[PDB]
Every structure is written in C-alpha cells, then in structure tokens.
Write a protein that binds this ligand. Structure first.
Ligand SMILES: Nc1ncnc2c1ncn2[C@@H]1O[C@H](COP(=O)(O)CP(=O)(O)O)[C@@H](O)[C@H]1O
Ligand SMILES: Nc1ncnc2c1ncn2[C@@H]1O[C@H](COP(=O)(O)CP(=O)(O)O)[C@@H](O)[C@H]1O
Lengths: 464, 464
C-alpha cells in the first residue's frame, strides 16, 4: 500500500490550484441533513493506512512513474512529498479531531476535522479526503444495522414484554454479497457494533486487530444447511438429508434450509410428521431452526408459522401472542433489508405471532445495498489561512440548499437540553456552550486517542 | 490472508452434512434469468487468493483456534485440511472451467464450474463458493458500465454520425464512494473493460499485476478543480479562482466545478463575459470543461447549454444538432447512474444538442449502487458422485421458478444461429453442438489459462 497512490487522480494537481501563500486548509466530515448516525470506522483507517512512516523514497518514485503515464505529463508534487519524508521521517503532518467512535449523533453535525500542522503541507488535508471519506461505509452499515435493531426491539417488546435474544435477531450473511474481502471485514465489524451474529469471519479479526474486546470473539454462529447439502441427497431423499443433519447436530442449535422443493410440504409432512419425533425431543438450548428462502417473505413466514402451529404445541405468552415450543424456531434469510424486516414483524404482530418465534439473516441488504447518498456523507473545506489571514470558506449551490456547507473552524457541543450543536466560525472559542466534544485522534503520524470495541458498543446502545 | 478463514462460517460444518460416500461435488455459477453479462474478474481471485500453497500448518492451527471460539464447539475439519497440506503441499485439489474473460453471455448460462479433483476433497468445492461468488461484483460493474456505453453509443451516433470519444464519455470518479480500498481497485478495473477514464489509480495497478496490457497504463485523467480549490479563494473571488486555474492548465483540458455559489451566473457572467477571452483562445486539444454539480441533472445540463450557446459561437453539425466550439465542453458528474445518464442524453437530443457536447462522471452510481440481485449471480451444486454413482442435483422452490437451478454436468455452446446454449445432464458429451466454450483456468493450485486485459477489452466490444 502506497498512500501517494490512494487519492483521486485530479487531487494530484490541486496543490497548484489553491490561492498563493496558503498555510492552512482545514476540512470537516458530516452526514448532511435516518436522523442520527453511529460514528464508527475511522480508527481502522488511521491505523491501517495513515499512521507511521507512510512515505518512503521508493513510494515517491513509484508514484512519480505512475502519474507520468496516467496524466502523460509531470504534474506530480514530488517536492512536497520529499519534504514530508525528510522533515518528518515520512510521518504525515496532519491533525484529525473526531467524536468518540460509537457515538450516536444527529445529522448535520461535524463528526471529524482534518488540518495540516505544517504550512508547507497545506495541500495534504485534501489529498487524504478520498481515503478518509471511505468511513461513510462503516458509518452507514452501523447506522442501518442500528435502525434495524430499533425496529426489532419495538416489536419484540410489544409482543413478548422484553428484549431477550435481541442481539442475535439479525445475523450477517453478507460475505459473498459484498464487493470484496476487505469490504466483508469492515462491514461485518460495523454490524457487530449492534449485534452479536456474523458468518463473516474477517469481521472478528478486524475488531481484534484495530479495536479490541474483552471476549475471545465479538461474533457468533451455529451449524446450518445450505441448498447443496440438502439437494446432494437427491430429490426423493430430502427427508434423509433432514434426518442426517439434525442427528449430526442434536445437541446444538441447527438451521435447516427447507424450501429446496416445497417448503410447505417440508414443514407439514417432513418436519411435522415423519421427523416430528426428532424435533420434540430437542433441548431449549438446541432448537431446530426452520429456514424458508423463497416466495413472498411475509406470506411465506405466515404460512410456515400456521403450518407449524397446527403440527406442534403452541402456547400463548403473557402478552397474548402465539409462541412455538422452545425446540422450534424460524429464520428468514431471503430478501431481508430494513424495509422488508419492518413488514415481516408488523405482519407477524397483526396475526398474533410473537417476534420470539423468528430471527433474520441478511446479506446484500445489510452490507452492500448502501451508498454514500443514504446519509449524505460529505467532506468539505470550511477554513483556510492565506497570507496569514484566516477566512471562512463554504459552498452554497443556488439550486440545492441541502448541499450548503459549514463555515470556519468547527466544534461540537452539548446544548443546555443535552442535545448536540455544531458551532461555526470559531464560535466555540467563546465558551458559551462548554467544551468541544471532538478529541484529537491523530497527529503528526501518531494515533493519539483510541477506543476498544466494548466502549464503541456501549456508546451505540439503544435508549432501551 | 488465510483461505481457511475466508468462507461463510456455516460452511465449516458442511463436510458432516453431505451424503456419506460422496466423492465429487460439482457446482456452477450463473447470472440467473440486463440481458447479457460481461464475464470479468475471476482471474484476479484465482491469483490473489486461490493459487499456490494456500494451506500451511500455521494456517490450520489459526483456523482451529478461531473456530473453537466462534462456534463454542469443535466442528472445524482439521483432518481434511491436513490432507491437502500433506498430499498436495498445500495446493487446492480443485478444477475450475470458465468462459473466457470479457465474453458477453446471455442470462441463465453457465459461466464457470467448480469440482474437486480428489475424492477426499468433496467438501472443498463449496468451501470456496463464498470467495468465488464475489466475482458477482466485477461481473456486474463491467456489465452495467457496458450497458451505459450502449446508451452513449446510440445517442452519439444518432446526434453526431460517429463514435469518436465514446471511450472517454463515462469517467470513474467512484474512489471515495466505494466501501473499501480493495473494492476501489476491483471496480475501477471492471469499468476499464469498457472505457479508458478513471481517477482511481488502484484499478491500473490491479490490471498490470493480474491481467497486463501493451499500454503503459489502461486509464487516464485530466486536471480538475474541486469545491475546496475554488471556495478557498473566498466567495467574492470565484473569478480569480477560475482565472488562476485555466491559466495554470492553459495547454491541457481542464475541468472546473462551476456551481459553488450560482452555476448559472458562473456560466453566463464569469465564463460568458469576464473570462471569455481566456476560453476562446484555447486549443481544441485543451478545452475548458465546465462542471455543474447540483440541481436536477437534466434541467441543469440543459440550462447550462442554453446559457453557453448564447455566449459562445454554436455551430450545427451534419445531423442538425447543436455543437459548442471545440474549446468548450460540459461534464455532468452529479447524480449519474444508468437511469439518469439515459434521461440526460434523451433530454439533450430532444432539445437538439449533440452528445458530443457532454461527458459524464459517475461515482456511487458506477461502483457502489449495485448488488448480487441485479443479475441474480448464483453458485449452486448440479452434480454429485455418491457410492460411485453420478446423480443430477438441483433446487426447484415451489413458490419461485426463477430460482430453479440447472441439473447435472454442464457445458456452454454456440448454437447453429450463433447464440449460446448451456447443455445439462452431461449432454455436451454427445457432441451435437461443437466445442465446450468453458476452459480449464485452474487445476490443483495452478492457474492454467490466462487472458491479458487487451483480449478482455476486445471480447467485451459493442456490436456496432
Ligand atoms: N444459513 C443461513 N441462514 C440464514 N440465511 C442464510 C443462510 N445462508 C444463506 N442465507 C441467506 O441467503 C444469502 C446467500 O444467498 P444464496 O447464495 O444461499 C441463495 P441465491 O442468492 O443463490 O438465490 C445470504 O446473504 C442470506 O441472506
Ligand atoms: N472532477 C470531477 N469530474 C466529474 N465528476 C466529479 C469530479 N469530482 C467529483 N465528481 C463527482 O462527485 C463525486 C464525489 O462527490 P463529492 O464529495 O465531490 C460532492 P458530495 O458528495 O460531498 O455532495 C464523484 O464520485 C463524481 O461523481
């Protein structure tokens, strides 16, 4: 990895575009006015890409050669990078201040600020915009995950009277459905800010390396069939496949994909009749989890539940909602995103089914179907010093007031009612609103302030 | 990077789930029935992740320990993995056959197949599903980028009578808008199958390392302002910003974001009067490229063109469409995806503006707003050998015929009319349909057939 090659091409020329005698460029990240965002993921970037000796004589030469061909010209700022190498032993002269990770913050508030700490390196702040802006992704995954947890909590409370099991109710199965290995680890770690369940091993390793937890792992999984392990038995042997699998995993929970040929038949005749004896013997600590995986997600779930309700001993919990026996559960892993999750739980509640009966798996919906537009993640310059004079800078496009950016030096504060406000134009120096909530997390090549994953989870909790 | 840790967790238990006495699991990848897809990206994954000695004792222990905590149980198949270490010096006993990269293939056809080459390794075919299915992403980016190129081609032809500059009409600005560094490089390279322009330099490194071109670089870029380099001058000095930049880059094309404050004023009064003299003197090889970046994408483009056509000498081309002077162009980079690109060119044609006038930048729309669902990318088992008998396996969910998978051993053929057919149930052996288009690309830890990026581009060409 070469930081000199991890920027948008066109930023290679920007050092020639600033007003002459600019000694300072100060920029900020916000999610422009999903009402509140979880701040997560910056520390990963600081550690993996930004900290330490990131410039070498070989990296300079590599970038020189690449840009010569990419531009067919010599725009590359070889001198500026040589300066950083010689003066700072390749350590970036940059200060980054940030809200603590895990913090839940309303939209349109400053989340982090970047500035150069050497006047020669005015051009550096925005060189690193590209890399730092990728934090949109773990912010957005964490926020969307947390929004889903809010929905799950509402209906579990309504239908059961408590939140037992909540943190296992939405499980990450997005490994194959993301755009890369590196994305898999980052997104899975972001989901684990809110939940405990992941099939994406790389998330755990990222957390261990970049954040740290008290546990050996933050993420968990249970044995489960896939279509290949059922259909390999042949069409006429779906029952033999079912019986082999539940018997192989008779004392731990086991998920079994049941829609290979006919989901309604598998539930009513195979699970509900031929193999019933192997289900009702099972422990509360080791349920069979029936997995539909096709058809209309709500309609399938309701019909699966009605079928099981006629074949197995259903009870009524203290809220008046129907509850399967504890050795039997359902998981819906097909077509799950925030919208369909809401429809499924509302539709279950309407038909008097406890949210205790169900859990969810999500892949693309959880980790891939998300863009920087969802939270309007944006990084803009708000303050420059030119000729020793500091000036408040901003954009304000005529045709879109939503893209208006903030002015001057920024700080984040608690209001007297305990909400958040971002003060502009250096006004946080007036001290009418207490101390700035941003901390310096990076300075001159060093990470200066850090958070364990446990602090992060704590910060990201629902009100409850 | 540990391949034993690069699967969905639940797959760890699948060696216990297949029928006893199974010696072969054969699986295939298709984009289930955007009617034709560009097959691109597998060769990256083969080289980075799959080839050579991928198993070591250290990797085995690491996996063993992680899995003990994740599952809170001993389910990891140490014996299977140790067998591969000792018998094959850690090389994967797997054969993969694939259609050549760059091939454009209709929906619902086999694109690659995977099988174990040693009966002891039956479980390995689907171990590596997760990592292989990640090919959905470069497949999908290349396909969606080619589809935008068809739209571009159509309207450029209709409005100008040729395709000059087509390969430069859609520029990749998606670096900051993707989910990670790795995605950035994979996505940029997939876009370069169809176009020449990227600001994501990692795409170029990937292509050189994994595919190779006779070109010194496969992608190119031009000097461009951002809001920071314009707004830094202060609100009253937009004109000085503009002036400084076009003078810095007088002899090459230069793109200037013009909507910081009021794009309509910038075009009419700043470019159109104040700085008109610095524009009209410019070379055809070095235009000013005006960049709007807000408002309704179509409306803003049209109004920008209306303003400019009143301040600058418009001609009418041989097809009757209006054309700005060669020193003056426009680039829309805001809000651009396949849908809006189509609306803009059609809006332009309706108002009698040539598509020669415009180029497009796309970020999230190009590299991030895509999922596995768009082309229904799917990997499924179609054939097993159990007790020395081959059986044809498939799924066929009652409620969703779109999810029916293919049966038996598969091959891809040219039809007599020159289309594609996938033969099922090993019927390709009857040899009624000429050569199987799938070629072995991986066998037993070695990459066996490679494509340069040059063949890939040639294979992915438009009809025209
Ligand atoms: N064991 C499991 N439990 C719950 N959901 C699962 C699951 N295995 C797979 N899924 C669901 O199915 C997705 C993976 O898609 P598949 O490759 O199994 C089916 P298809 O996309 O080929 O039609 C996951 O992202 C998840 O939503
Ligand atoms: N030089 C340029 N030419 C064309 N489009 C550009 C561009 N620079 C940025 N863009 C467009 O804007 C996207 C980057 O978003 P920005 O951070 O510049 C504005 P915002 O996202 O904060 O509202 C790029 O992916 C691209 O579509």
């Amino acid at each position: 990895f070469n930081i000199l090659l991890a920027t948008d091409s066109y930023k290679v020329t920007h050092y020639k575009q600033y007003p002459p005698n600019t000694s300072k460029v100060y920029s900020y990240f916000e999610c422009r006015e999903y009402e509140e965002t979880v701040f997560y993921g910056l520390q990963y970037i600081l550690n993996k890409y930004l900290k330490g000796k990131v410039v070498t004589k070989e990296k300079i030469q590599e970038a020189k050669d690449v840009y010569k061909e990419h531009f067919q010209d010599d725009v590359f700022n070889e001198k500026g990078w040589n300066y950083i190498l010689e003066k700072y032993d390749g350590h970036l002269p940059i200060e980054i201040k940030a809200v603590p990770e895990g913090f839940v913050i309303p939209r349109g508030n400053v989340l982090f600020t970047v500035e150069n700490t050497d006047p020669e390196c005015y051009w550096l702040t925005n060189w690193i915009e590209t890399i730092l802006v990728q934090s949109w992704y773990p912010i957005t995954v964490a926020t969307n995950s947390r929004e889903q947890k809010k929905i799950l909590a509402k209906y579990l409370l309504e239908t059961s009277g408590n939140l037992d099991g909540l943190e296992y109710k939405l499980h990450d199965f997005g490994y194959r459905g993301v755009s890369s290995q590196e994305t898999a680890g980052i997104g899975a770690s972001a989901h684990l800010v809110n939940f405990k369940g992941t099939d994406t091993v790389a998330g755990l390793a990222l957390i261990k390396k970049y954040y740290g937890t008290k546990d050996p792992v933050p993420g968990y999984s249970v044995p489960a069939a896939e279509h290949s392990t059922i259909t390999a038995w042949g069409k006429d042997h779906e029952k033999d496949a079912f019986e082999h699998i539940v018997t192989q995993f008779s004392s731990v929970p086991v998920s079994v994909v049941s829609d290979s040929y006919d989901i309604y038949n598998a539930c009513e005749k195979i699970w509900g009749e031929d193999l019933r004896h192997l289900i009702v013997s099972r422990s509360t600590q080791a349920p069979l989890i029936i997995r539909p995986d096709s058809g209309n997600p709500l309609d399938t779930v309701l019909k699966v539940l009605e079928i099981l309700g006629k074949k197995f001993p259903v009870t009524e919990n203290s809220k008046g909602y129907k509850l399967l026996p504890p050795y039997l559960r359902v998981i819906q892993g097909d077509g799950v995103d925030i919208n369909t999750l809401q429809e499924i739980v509302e539709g279950m509640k309407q038909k008097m089914w406890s949210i205790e009966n169900i859990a969810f798996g999500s892949g693309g919906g959880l980790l891939q179907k998300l863009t920087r537009d969802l939270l309007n993640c944006s990084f803009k310059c708000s303050y420059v010093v030119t000729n020793g004079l500091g000036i408040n800078v901003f954009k304000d496009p005529v045709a879109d007031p939503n893209k208006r950016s903030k002015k001057g030096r920024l700080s984040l504060h608690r209001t007297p009612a305990g909400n958040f406000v971002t003060l502009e134009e250096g006004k946080g120096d007036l001290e009418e609103y207490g101390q700035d909530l941003l901390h310096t997390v990076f300075k001159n090549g060093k990470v200066t302030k850090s958070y364990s994953f446990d602090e992060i989870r704590k910060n990201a909790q629902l009100n409850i």
